Nucleic acid binder design. Sequence first.
DNA 1: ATGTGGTCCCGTGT
DNA 2: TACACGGGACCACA
Lengths: 73, 56
Amino acid sequence: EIVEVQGGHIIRATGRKDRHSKVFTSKGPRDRRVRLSAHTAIQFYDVQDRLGYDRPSKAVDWLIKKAKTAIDK
Amino acid sequence: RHSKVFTSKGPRDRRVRLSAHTAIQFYDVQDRLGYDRPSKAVDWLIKKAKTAIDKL
DNA sequence: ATGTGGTCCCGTGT
DNA sequence: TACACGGGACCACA
């Protein structure tokens, strides 16, 4: 079940056991969690804390807004 | 075991759930970069942002 | 009702 | 072997 959102699209959850939305991407629906390797998780959680952000997703937003130049290329 | 890492705030998990807003954008980077696993997109994003990380 | 962050168990693959 | 990734289910919460 598709639903439009700022910058992309979202799929409503199908089963009753979990009501987590997935996001639509270039390779189809995708779950919203992501595992990070240990090395990466250590450096990622640093930055997060150096920004004093509670939630990791807010540090991924920062990182993206901060690599915008790169990304767009 | 091993799914936690030692951070300045205590032990934290290596699997983290991105908000729909964030995931839409973050997966775009990973897909654009053509990386198989999303952790590698984070290594990039991080490295492509040292300049700022270095401040504060 | 329906989303949320976040974590546990486990199947599978490096 | 040991470690890794990610699907499914799940709790507390709003």
